[PDB]
CSV table of C-alpha atoms and ligand atoms in Angstrom, one decimal:
chain,number,residue,atom,x,y,z
A,1,UNK,CA,27.1,21.1,19.5
A,2,UNK,CA,24.5,19.2,21.5
A,3,UNK,CA,23.3,22.3,23.3
A,4,UNK,CA,22.9,24.3,20.0
A,5,UNK,CA,21.0,21.4,18.4
A,6,UNK,CA,18.6,21.0,21.3
A,7,UNK,CA,17.9,24.7,21.4
A,8,UNK,CA,17.2,24.8,17.7
A,9,UNK,CA,14.8,21.9,17.8
A,10,UNK,CA,13.2,23.4,20.9
A,11,UNK,CA,12.7,26.6,19.0
A,12,UNK,CA,11.2,24.8,16.0
A,13,UNK,CA,8.7,23.0,18.2
A,14,UNK,CA,7.3,26.4,19.3
A,15,UNK,CA,5.8,26.9,15.9
A,16,UNK,CA,2.1,28.1,16.1
A,17,UNK,CA,1.2,25.2,13.8
A,18,UNK,CA,1.7,22.8,16.7
A,19,UNK,CA,-0.9,24.7,18.7
A,20,UNK,CA,-2.8,22.3,20.9
A,21,UNK,CA,-0.8,19.4,19.4
A,22,UNK,CA,1.2,16.8,21.3
A,23,UNK,CA,4.5,15.9,19.5
A,24,UNK,CA,6.7,13.0,20.3
A,25,UNK,CA,10.2,13.9,19.1
A,26,UNK,CA,13.2,11.6,19.6
A,27,UNK,CA,16.6,11.7,18.1
A,28,UNK,CA,19.4,9.2,18.8
A,29,UNK,CA,22.9,8.6,17.4
A,30,UNK,CA,22.8,5.0,16.2
A,31,UNK,CA,26.6,4.6,16.4
A,32,UNK,CA,27.0,5.7,20.0
A,33,UNK,CA,23.5,5.4,21.4
A,34,UNK,CA,23.7,9.0,22.7
A,35,UNK,CA,20.2,10.4,23.1
A,36,UNK,CA,20.5,13.7,21.2
A,37,UNK,CA,16.8,14.8,21.7
A,38,UNK,CA,13.8,13.6,23.5
A,39,UNK,CA,10.4,15.1,24.1
A,40,UNK,CA,7.2,13.1,25.0
A,41,UNK,CA,9.0,10.0,23.7
A,42,UNK,CA,6.7,7.7,25.7
A,43,UNK,CA,3.4,9.4,24.7
A,44,UNK,CA,1.1,7.0,22.8
A,45,UNK,CA,0.1,8.7,19.5
A,46,UNK,CA,-1.6,7.7,16.3
A,47,UNK,CA,1.2,6.9,13.7
A,48,UNK,CA,-0.7,7.1,10.4
A,49,UNK,CA,1.5,5.5,7.7
A,50,UNK,CA,4.5,5.3,10.0
A,51,UNK,CA,2.8,2.1,11.1
A,52,UNK,CA,4.3,0.6,7.9
A,53,UNK,CA,7.7,0.8,9.4
A,54,UNK,CA,6.6,-1.9,11.9
A,55,UNK,CA,4.8,-3.9,9.2
A,56,UNK,CA,7.8,-3.9,6.8
A,57,UNK,CA,10.2,-4.9,9.5
A,58,UNK,CA,8.0,-7.8,10.6
A,59,UNK,CA,7.5,-8.8,7.0
A,60,UNK,CA,11.3,-9.1,6.4
A,61,UNK,CA,11.7,-11.0,9.6
A,62,UNK,CA,8.9,-13.4,9.0
A,63,UNK,CA,8.7,-13.8,5.2
A,64,UNK,CA,12.3,-12.9,4.4
A,65,UNK,CA,13.7,-10.6,1.8
A,66,UNK,CA,13.9,-13.4,-0.7
A,67,UNK,CA,10.2,-14.3,-0.3
A,68,UNK,CA,8.1,-14.3,-3.5
A,69,UNK,CA,4.3,-14.6,-4.0
A,70,UNK,CA,2.5,-16.9,-6.4
A,71,UNK,CA,-0.7,-17.2,-8.4
A,72,UNK,CA,-1.9,-20.3,-10.1
A,73,UNK,CA,-4.5,-21.7,-12.6
A,74,UNK,CA,-5.8,-25.2,-12.2
A,75,UNK,CA,-8.5,-27.7,-13.2
A,76,UNK,CA,-9.4,-31.1,-11.7
A,77,UNK,CA,-7.2,-32.7,-14.4
A,78,UNK,CA,-5.4,-31.8,-17.7
A,79,UNK,CA,-7.6,-31.0,-20.7
A,80,UNK,CA,-8.9,-34.0,-22.7
A,81,UNK,CA,-9.1,-35.0,-26.3
A,82,UNK,CA,-11.0,-31.9,-27.5
A,83,UNK,CA,-8.9,-29.8,-25.2
A,84,UNK,CA,-11.8,-29.3,-22.9
A,85,UNK,CA,-12.0,-29.0,-19.1
A,86,UNK,CA,-15.0,-28.3,-16.8
A,87,UNK,CA,-14.5,-25.7,-14.1
A,88,UNK,CA,-11.4,-23.6,-13.9
A,89,UNK,CA,-9.8,-21.8,-10.9
A,90,UNK,CA,-7.6,-18.7,-10.7
A,91,UNK,CA,-5.9,-19.0,-7.3
A,92,UNK,CA,-4.1,-16.0,-5.8
A,93,UNK,CA,-1.8,-16.4,-2.8
A,94,UNK,CA,-1.1,-12.8,-1.8
A,95,UNK,CA,0.7,-11.3,-4.7
A,96,UNK,CA,0.4,-7.5,-4.2
A,97,UNK,CA,1.9,-6.9,-7.7
A,98,UNK,CA,-0.3,-9.2,-9.9
A,99,UNK,CA,-0.9,-7.2,-13.1
A,100,UNK,CA,-3.3,-7.5,-16.0
A,101,UNK,CA,-0.3,-8.4,-18.2
A,102,UNK,CA,0.5,-11.2,-15.7
A,103,UNK,CA,-3.0,-12.5,-16.2
A,104,UNK,CA,-2.6,-12.5,-20.0
A,105,UNK,CA,0.6,-14.4,-19.7
A,106,UNK,CA,-1.2,-17.0,-17.6
A,107,UNK,CA,-4.1,-17.2,-20.0
A,108,UNK,CA,-1.5,-17.9,-22.7
A,109,UNK,CA,-0.1,-20.8,-20.6
A,110,UNK,CA,-3.7,-22.2,-20.2
A,111,UNK,CA,-3.9,-22.2,-24.0
A,112,UNK,CA,-0.3,-23.5,-24.4
A,113,UNK,CA,-1.3,-26.2,-21.9
A,114,UNK,CA,-3.8,-27.6,-24.4
A,115,UNK,CA,-6.9,-26.0,-23.1
A,116,UNK,CA,-9.4,-24.7,-25.7
A,117,UNK,CA,-12.8,-24.8,-23.9
A,118,UNK,CA,-13.8,-24.3,-20.3
A,119,UNK,CA,-17.1,-26.0,-20.4
A,120,UNK,CA,-17.7,-25.3,-16.7
A,121,UNK,CA,-17.5,-22.1,-14.7
A,122,UNK,CA,-14.5,-19.9,-13.9
A,123,UNK,CA,-13.8,-19.3,-10.3
A,124,UNK,CA,-11.6,-16.7,-8.6
A,125,UNK,CA,-10.0,-18.3,-5.5
A,126,UNK,CA,-8.8,-15.9,-2.8
A,127,UNK,CA,-9.4,-18.3,0.1
A,128,UNK,CA,-5.7,-17.9,0.9
A,129,UNK,CA,-6.8,-14.9,3.0
A,130,UNK,CA,-10.1,-14.6,4.8
A,131,UNK,CA,-12.9,-12.6,3.3
A,132,UNK,CA,-12.7,-9.6,5.7
A,133,UNK,CA,-12.2,-6.9,3.2
A,134,UNK,CA,-11.8,-3.8,5.4
A,135,UNK,CA,-10.5,-3.1,8.9
A,136,UNK,CA,-13.4,-2.7,11.4
A,137,UNK,CA,-12.8,1.0,12.3
A,138,UNK,CA,-11.9,2.2,8.8
A,139,UNK,CA,-14.2,5.0,7.7
A,140,UNK,CA,-16.8,4.0,5.1
A,141,UNK,CA,-16.6,7.4,3.4
A,142,UNK,CA,-13.1,6.6,2.4
A,143,UNK,CA,-14.0,3.3,0.7
A,144,UNK,CA,-14.1,4.7,-3.0
A,145,UNK,CA,-10.5,5.7,-2.8
A,146,UNK,CA,-7.4,3.7,-3.7
A,147,UNK,CA,-5.8,3.8,-0.2
A,148,UNK,CA,-9.0,2.1,1.1
A,149,UNK,CA,-9.1,-0.7,-1.4
A,150,UNK,CA,-10.6,-4.0,-0.2
A,151,UNK,CA,-8.1,-6.7,0.9
A,152,UNK,CA,-7.9,-10.0,-0.9
A,153,UNK,CA,-5.4,-12.8,-1.6
A,154,UNK,CA,-6.3,-12.4,-5.3
A,155,UNK,CA,-6.2,-8.9,-6.5
A,156,UNK,CA,-5.1,-7.0,-9.7
A,157,UNK,CA,-2.6,-4.3,-9.1
A,158,UNK,CA,-2.7,-1.2,-11.4
A,159,UNK,CA,0.2,0.6,-12.9
A,160,UNK,CA,3.9,0.5,-12.0
A,161,UNK,CA,3.2,1.5,-8.4
A,162,UNK,CA,0.9,-1.5,-8.1
A,163,UNK,CA,-2.2,0.0,-6.6
A,164,UNK,CA,-4.4,-3.0,-5.8
A,165,UNK,CA,-8.2,-3.6,-6.0
A,166,UNK,CA,-8.8,-0.5,-8.0
A,167,UNK,CA,-9.8,0.5,-11.6
A,168,UNK,CA,-8.8,3.7,-13.4
A,169,UNK,CA,-11.8,5.8,-14.3
A,170,UNK,CA,-11.4,8.3,-17.2
A,171,UNK,CA,-13.7,11.2,-18.1
A,172,UNK,CA,-13.4,13.0,-21.4
A,173,UNK,CA,-15.4,16.1,-22.4
A,174,UNK,CA,-17.7,16.1,-25.4
A,175,UNK,CA,-19.5,19.1,-26.9
A,176,UNK,CA,-21.3,21.5,-24.6
A,177,UNK,CA,-24.5,20.0,-23.4
A,178,UNK,CA,-23.6,16.5,-24.4
A,179,UNK,CA,-22.9,13.7,-21.8
A,180,UNK,CA,-19.3,13.3,-20.8
A,181,UNK,CA,-17.5,10.2,-22.0
A,182,UNK,CA,-16.8,8.0,-19.0
A,183,UNK,CA,-14.6,4.9,-19.2
A,184,UNK,CA,-14.3,2.4,-16.3
A,185,UNK,CA,-10.9,1.0,-17.2
A,186,UNK,CA,-10.4,-2.6,-16.1
A,187,UNK,CA,-13.7,-2.5,-14.3
A,188,UNK,CA,-15.6,-2.2,-17.7
A,189,UNK,CA,-18.1,-5.1,-17.7
A,190,UNK,CA,-17.8,-5.6,-14.0
A,191,UNK,CA,-18.7,-2.4,-12.1
A,192,UNK,CA,-21.9,-0.7,-13.0
A,193,UNK,CA,-21.8,2.9,-14.4
A,194,UNK,CA,-24.2,5.7,-13.4
A,195,UNK,CA,-23.1,8.6,-15.6
A,196,UNK,CA,-25.0,11.8,-14.8
A,197,UNK,CA,-22.0,14.0,-15.9
A,198,UNK,CA,-22.4,16.6,-18.6
A,199,UNK,CA,-20.0,18.7,-20.7
A,200,UNK,CA,-20.1,22.3,-19.6
A,201,UNK,CA,-19.4,25.3,-21.9
A,202,UNK,CA,-15.8,26.1,-22.6
A,203,UNK,CA,-14.3,28.2,-19.8
A,204,UNK,CA,-17.1,27.0,-17.4
A,205,UNK,CA,-16.4,25.7,-13.8
A,206,UNK,CA,-15.3,22.1,-13.4
A,207,UNK,CA,-17.6,20.4,-10.8
A,208,UNK,CA,-17.0,16.8,-11.8
A,209,UNK,CA,-17.4,14.2,-9.0
A,210,UNK,CA,-16.5,10.5,-9.3
A,211,UNK,CA,-17.8,8.3,-6.5
A,212,UNK,CA,-18.7,4.7,-5.6
A,213,UNK,CA,-21.8,4.9,-3.4
A,214,UNK,CA,-21.2,3.0,-0.2
A,215,UNK,CA,-22.2,-0.6,-0.3
A,216,UNK,CA,-22.5,-0.6,-4.1
A,217,UNK,CA,-20.3,-1.6,-7.0
A,218,UNK,CA,-21.3,1.3,-9.1
A,219,UNK,CA,-19.2,4.2,-10.3
A,220,UNK,CA,-21.4,7.3,-10.0
A,221,UNK,CA,-20.3,10.4,-11.9
A,222,UNK,CA,-22.0,13.8,-11.5
A,223,UNK,CA,-21.3,17.4,-12.1
A,224,UNK,CA,-20.0,19.2,-15.2
A,225,UNK,CA,-16.6,19.0,-17.0
A,226,UNK,CA,-15.9,22.0,-19.3
A,227,UNK,CA,-15.6,21.3,-23.0
A,228,UNK,CA,-12.1,22.7,-23.0
A,229,UNK,CA,-11.0,20.9,-19.8
A,230,UNK,CA,-8.3,18.3,-19.9
A,231,UNK,CA,-9.6,14.7,-19.7
A,232,UNK,CA,-9.7,13.5,-16.0
A,233,UNK,CA,-8.5,10.2,-14.5
A,234,UNK,CA,-9.1,8.8,-11.1
A,235,UNK,CA,-8.4,5.5,-9.3
A,236,UNK,CA,-11.5,4.1,-7.8
A,237,UNK,CA,-12.0,0.9,-5.7
A,238,UNK,CA,-14.3,-1.9,-6.7
A,239,UNK,CA,-16.2,-4.3,-4.5
A,240,UNK,CA,-14.6,-7.8,-4.4
A,241,UNK,CA,-11.1,-7.4,-6.0
A,242,UNK,CA,-11.0,-11.2,-6.7
A,243,UNK,CA,-14.2,-11.0,-8.7
A,244,UNK,CA,-12.7,-8.4,-10.9
A,245,UNK,CA,-9.5,-10.5,-11.4
A,246,UNK,CA,-11.9,-13.2,-12.5
A,247,UNK,CA,-13.4,-10.9,-15.0
A,248,UNK,CA,-10.0,-9.8,-16.3
A,249,UNK,CA,-8.9,-13.4,-16.5
A,250,UNK,CA,-12.1,-14.3,-18.3
A,251,UNK,CA,-11.2,-11.6,-20.9
A,252,UNK,CA,-7.6,-12.8,-21.1
A,253,UNK,CA,-8.6,-16.4,-21.7
A,254,UNK,CA,-11.0,-15.2,-24.4
A,255,UNK,CA,-8.2,-13.2,-26.0
A,256,UNK,CA,-5.8,-16.2,-26.0
A,257,UNK,CA,-8.2,-18.6,-27.8
A,258,UNK,CA,-9.8,-20.1,-24.7
A,259,UNK,CA,-13.6,-20.0,-24.6
A,260,UNK,CA,-15.4,-20.0,-21.2
A,261,UNK,CA,-19.0,-21.4,-21.4
A,262,UNK,CA,-20.1,-21.0,-17.8
A,263,UNK,CA,-20.2,-18.1,-15.5
A,264,UNK,CA,-17.5,-16.2,-13.6
A,265,UNK,CA,-17.5,-16.0,-9.8
A,266,UNK,CA,-15.9,-16.5,-6.4
A,267,UNK,CA,-14.9,-20.0,-5.1
A,268,UNK,CA,-12.1,-22.1,-3.8
A,269,UNK,CA,-10.7,-25.4,-5.0
A,270,UNK,CA,-13.1,-28.2,-4.0
A,271,UNK,CA,-10.5,-29.8,-1.8
A,272,UNK,CA,-12.1,-33.0,-2.9
A,273,UNK,CA,-9.6,-32.6,-5.8
A,274,UNK,CA,-6.6,-34.8,-4.9
A,275,UNK,CA,-4.7,-34.3,-8.1
A,276,UNK,CA,-5.6,-30.9,-9.5
A,277,UNK,CA,-3.7,-29.9,-12.7
A,278,UNK,CA,-1.9,-26.6,-12.6
A,279,UNK,CA,-2.2,-25.2,-16.1
A,280,UNK,CA,-0.6,-21.9,-15.4
A,281,UNK,CA,1.3,-20.0,-12.7
A,282,UNK,CA,3.1,-16.8,-11.9
A,283,UNK,CA,5.7,-15.8,-9.4
A,284,UNK,CA,6.1,-12.2,-8.2
A,285,UNK,CA,9.4,-10.4,-7.7
A,286,UNK,CA,11.0,-10.9,-4.3
A,287,UNK,CA,9.9,-9.0,-1.2
A,288,UNK,CA,13.1,-6.9,-1.2
A,289,UNK,CA,12.0,-5.4,-4.5
A,290,UNK,CA,8.3,-5.1,-3.6
A,291,UNK,CA,9.3,-3.0,-0.6
A,292,UNK,CA,10.2,-0.2,-2.9
A,293,UNK,CA,6.7,0.7,-4.3
A,294,UNK,CA,5.2,-0.3,-0.9
A,295,UNK,CA,7.2,2.1,1.3
A,296,UNK,CA,8.1,4.8,-1.2
A,297,UNK,CA,4.4,5.5,-2.0
A,298,UNK,CA,2.9,4.3,1.3
A,299,UNK,CA,0.7,1.6,-0.3
A,300,UNK,CA,-2.0,0.5,2.2
A,301,UNK,CA,-3.1,-2.5,0.3
A,302,UNK,CA,0.4,-3.9,0.3
A,303,UNK,CA,0.7,-3.4,4.0
A,304,UNK,CA,-2.5,-5.3,4.8
A,305,UNK,CA,-1.7,-8.1,2.4
A,306,UNK,CA,1.7,-8.5,4.1
A,307,UNK,CA,0.1,-8.7,7.5
A,308,UNK,CA,-2.2,-11.5,6.3
A,309,UNK,CA,0.7,-13.2,4.6
A,310,UNK,CA,2.5,-13.0,7.9
A,311,UNK,CA,-0.5,-14.7,9.5
A,312,UNK,CA,-0.4,-17.5,6.9
A,313,UNK,CA,3.3,-18.1,7.5
A,314,UNK,CA,3.1,-18.1,11.3
A,315,UNK,CA,-0.3,-19.7,11.9
A,316,UNK,CA,-1.6,-20.8,8.5
A,317,UNK,CA,-4.3,-18.1,8.7
A,318,UNK,CA,-4.4,-15.2,6.4
A,319,UNK,CA,-6.2,-13.0,8.9
A,320,UNK,CA,-5.6,-9.6,10.6
A,321,UNK,CA,-5.8,-11.2,14.1
A,322,UNK,CA,-3.2,-13.8,13.3
A,323,UNK,CA,-1.1,-11.4,11.2
A,324,UNK,CA,-1.0,-8.7,13.9
A,325,UNK,CA,0.1,-11.2,16.5
A,326,UNK,CA,2.8,-12.3,14.1
A,327,UNK,CA,3.9,-8.7,13.6
A,328,UNK,CA,4.2,-8.1,17.4
A,329,UNK,CA,6.1,-11.3,18.0
A,330,UNK,CA,8.4,-10.6,15.1
A,331,UNK,CA,9.2,-7.1,16.5
A,332,UNK,CA,9.8,-8.5,20.0
A,333,UNK,CA,12.1,-11.2,18.5
A,334,UNK,CA,14.0,-8.3,16.9
A,335,UNK,CA,14.6,-6.8,20.3
A,336,UNK,CA,11.9,-4.1,20.1
A,337,UNK,CA,10.0,-3.4,23.3
A,338,UNK,CA,6.4,-3.4,22.1
A,339,UNK,CA,4.8,-2.3,25.4
A,340,UNK,CA,3.5,1.0,24.1
A,341,UNK,CA,2.4,-0.4,20.8
A,342,UNK,CA,-1.2,-1.1,19.8
A,343,UNK,CA,-1.6,-2.8,16.5
A,344,UNK,CA,-4.9,-2.6,14.7
A,345,UNK,CA,-3.8,-2.8,11.0
A,346,UNK,CA,-0.5,-2.8,9.1
A,347,UNK,CA,-1.0,0.3,6.9
A,348,UNK,CA,-1.7,2.9,9.6
A,349,UNK,CA,-5.0,3.9,8.1
A,350,UNK,CA,-6.8,2.7,11.2
A,351,UNK,CA,-7.4,5.3,14.0
A,352,UNK,CA,-7.0,2.4,16.4
A,353,UNK,CA,-3.2,2.2,16.0
A,354,UNK,CA,-0.8,3.6,18.6
A,355,UNK,CA,3.0,3.9,18.8
A,356,UNK,CA,5.4,6.1,20.8
A,357,UNK,CA,8.3,8.0,19.3
A,358,UNK,CA,10.6,5.9,21.5
A,359,UNK,CA,9.3,2.7,20.1
A,360,UNK,CA,9.8,4.0,16.5
A,361,UNK,CA,13.4,4.9,17.2
A,362,UNK,CA,13.9,1.5,18.9
A,363,UNK,CA,12.7,-0.2,15.8
A,364,UNK,CA,14.9,2.0,13.6
A,365,UNK,CA,17.9,1.0,15.7
A,366,UNK,CA,17.2,-2.8,15.7
A,367,UNK,CA,16.3,-2.8,12.0
A,368,UNK,CA,19.4,-0.9,11.0
A,369,UNK,CA,21.4,-3.8,12.6
A,370,UNK,CA,19.5,-6.7,11.1
A,371,UNK,CA,20.8,-8.7,8.1
A,372,UNK,CA,18.2,-7.0,5.8
A,373,UNK,CA,19.1,-3.4,6.9
A,374,UNK,CA,20.1,-2.3,3.5
A,375,UNK,CA,17.0,-3.5,1.6
A,376,UNK,CA,15.0,-2.0,4.4
A,377,UNK,CA,16.5,1.5,4.4
A,378,UNK,CA,16.5,1.5,0.6
A,379,UNK,CA,12.7,1.3,0.5
A,380,UNK,CA,12.4,4.5,2.4
A,381,UNK,CA,11.5,7.7,0.7
A,382,UNK,CA,14.6,9.9,0.2
A,383,UNK,CA,14.1,13.6,0.9
A,384,UNK,CA,14.0,15.9,-2.2
A,385,UNK,CA,14.6,13.3,-4.9
A,386,UNK,CA,12.7,14.0,-8.1
A,387,UNK,CA,12.5,10.4,-9.3
A,388,UNK,CA,9.2,9.2,-7.8
A,389,UNK,CA,10.7,5.7,-7.1
A,390,UNK,CA,13.5,7.3,-5.1
A,391,UNK,CA,11.9,10.4,-3.5
A,392,UNK,CA,8.5,8.7,-2.9
A,393,UNK,CA,6.2,10.8,-0.7
A,394,UNK,CA,9.2,13.1,0.1
A,395,UNK,CA,9.9,13.9,-3.6
A,396,UNK,CA,8.6,17.4,-3.2
A,397,UNK,CA,10.0,18.2,0.3
A,398,UNK,CA,13.4,19.5,1.5
A,399,UNK,CA,14.6,20.0,-2.1
A,400,UNK,CA,17.7,22.1,-2.1
A,401,UNK,CA,18.5,21.6,1.6
A,402,UNK,CA,21.2,19.7,3.4
A,403,UNK,CA,18.6,17.0,3.7
A,404,UNK,CA,18.2,16.4,0.0
A,405,UNK,CA,19.5,12.9,-0.9
A,406,UNK,CA,20.3,12.2,2.7
A,407,UNK,CA,17.2,11.8,4.9
A,408,UNK,CA,15.6,8.4,4.5
A,409,UNK,CA,12.2,8.6,6.2
A,410,UNK,CA,8.6,7.2,6.2
A,411,UNK,CA,5.8,9.7,6.1
A,412,UNK,CA,2.2,9.5,7.4
A,413,UNK,CA,-0.6,12.1,7.5
A,414,UNK,CA,-4.3,12.0,8.2
A,415,UNK,CA,-6.6,14.6,9.8
A,416,UNK,CA,-5.0,15.7,13.0
A,417,UNK,CA,-2.1,13.2,12.5
A,418,UNK,CA,1.3,13.6,11.0
A,419,UNK,CA,4.6,11.8,11.3
A,420,UNK,CA,8.1,11.6,9.9
A,421,UNK,CA,10.6,9.0,11.1
A,422,UNK,CA,13.8,7.6,9.6
A,423,UNK,CA,17.5,8.0,9.3
A,424,UNK,CA,20.0,10.8,8.7
A,425,UNK,CA,23.4,9.3,7.8
A,426,UNK,CA,26.5,11.5,7.7
A,427,UNK,CA,30.2,11.7,8.7
A,428,UNK,CA,29.2,13.3,12.0
A,429,UNK,CA,27.3,10.1,13.0
A,430,UNK,CA,24.4,7.9,11.9
A,431,UNK,CA,21.2,9.5,13.3
A,432,UNK,CA,17.8,7.9,13.8
A,433,UNK,CA,14.7,10.0,14.6
A,434,UNK,CA,11.0,10.0,15.0
A,435,UNK,CA,8.5,12.9,14.9
A,436,UNK,CA,4.9,12.1,15.6
A,437,UNK,CA,2.4,15.0,15.8
A,438,UNK,CA,-1.2,14.5,17.0
A,439,UNK,CA,-3.8,17.2,17.8
A,440,UNK,CA,-2.9,20.1,15.4
A,441,UNK,CA,-6.0,21.8,13.8
A,442,UNK,CA,-4.8,22.9,10.4
A,443,UNK,CA,-2.6,21.4,7.7
A,444,UNK,CA,-0.1,18.8,8.9
A,445,UNK,CA,3.0,20.5,10.3
A,446,UNK,CA,5.1,19.3,7.4
A,447,UNK,CA,7.3,22.4,7.4
A,448,UNK,CA,8.0,21.8,11.1
A,449,UNK,CA,9.0,18.2,10.3
A,450,UNK,CA,11.2,19.4,7.4
A,451,UNK,CA,12.9,22.0,9.5
A,452,UNK,CA,13.9,19.4,12.1
A,453,UNK,CA,15.1,16.9,9.4
A,454,UNK,CA,17.2,19.6,7.7
A,455,UNK,CA,18.7,20.6,11.1
A,456,UNK,CA,19.6,17.0,11.7
A,457,UNK,CA,21.2,16.6,8.3
A,458,UNK,CA,23.4,19.7,9.1
A,459,UNK,CA,24.3,18.2,12.5
A,460,UNK,CA,25.1,14.9,10.7
A,461,UNK,CA,27.7,16.9,8.6
A,462,UNK,CA,25.8,17.9,5.5
A,463,UNK,CA,25.5,21.2,3.7
A,464,UNK,CA,22.7,22.5,1.4
A,465,UNK,CA,23.6,22.2,-2.3
A,466,UNK,CA,24.1,25.6,-4.0
B,1,MG,MG1,-14.5,-6.0,-19.0
B,2,MG,MG1,25.0,15.6,1.8
């Protein structure tokens, strides 16, 4: 069977879509260790979001599947007679799933603690991580979009997928010629609004554009939305995620009967506060659960926060430099040869990252044998599964094939970069594979990747559902 499998993959890799592209393709049988396929396995290539495989593995090794993240609220001391306190601090310690509802629950605790008036100022403390918001080589033109959200120890996650450091912008048509209605979501009262958008005639062309001009905290909207067009929503990033959380907490407190007299801003506990009083706190779900939205949807913010959390745990420094060292050491301790690996970030967004298909398969093998193997493989997108939380970024791929509900793999695509690596379990043996394509000039070779995955599923003993 080996000869037929190899010839079939050989044939697939001849696709004109891979024209001028270099593709590292490696397939191994996890049970036996037999190398089923190998081409350019040692070639260093950009991994895109496949970098998250390394980050997740390191996170489970360093933080542990049972690790949880916390957020707290504290004053120098408990409220006095009139239920007053001076300055108040909202302190985040890396929770990548801190919601606005979580903030309200904490605001309620502040009230239930006996607080009625914050005579001082409200401060958002995200000193748990450093203030380096973006990776050095990330592209500035990508900054307005969710995947490029600024990194902070204190950030509000939006929706059930927990997209951090963003706000949901909504644009609703009015009558022809009238300005379009633009809502800034959570960022109302925080980010500035520059609405230049107008409502076009019914049946006209939609030319709406929602942007956040580089280096500003303004949501600029331009173009025209037809009067008969459906309302539009878009996630847009905001400058200083912690400052937004402060705004949102300010509103929460207000809604729970707690008045804030001073201003809202960034700042850490004075340290000259020996007995601070924690009026409220929140604990996130455990890492094993957080991995799901993280890996299924390829959440960049989660990845970078995990790296910095890894840095705090290994060196008391929530920094990329310390975090990336922690990741490499965690991988080596796992038995992975990191020689051909270059770590520049944990999400894979950075063009400075490098991996080799052999290194990916190596990781897949070691991780599959670790005590957290099940929680790890469960976080991976499952090919062709309609449920977003199961199919993830593979929900619309390989549906109706032998791979549907079988292939567990992480995706990763950017201009000129595409990858698919994971597992293909079956009665004919547990397979591990990695496909990394760099250099193609058109759309990512997703169909090529799919073809190979389906062929592997068939080799593993599966049949397409009829
Ligand atoms: Mg507001
Ligand atoms: Mg099957």
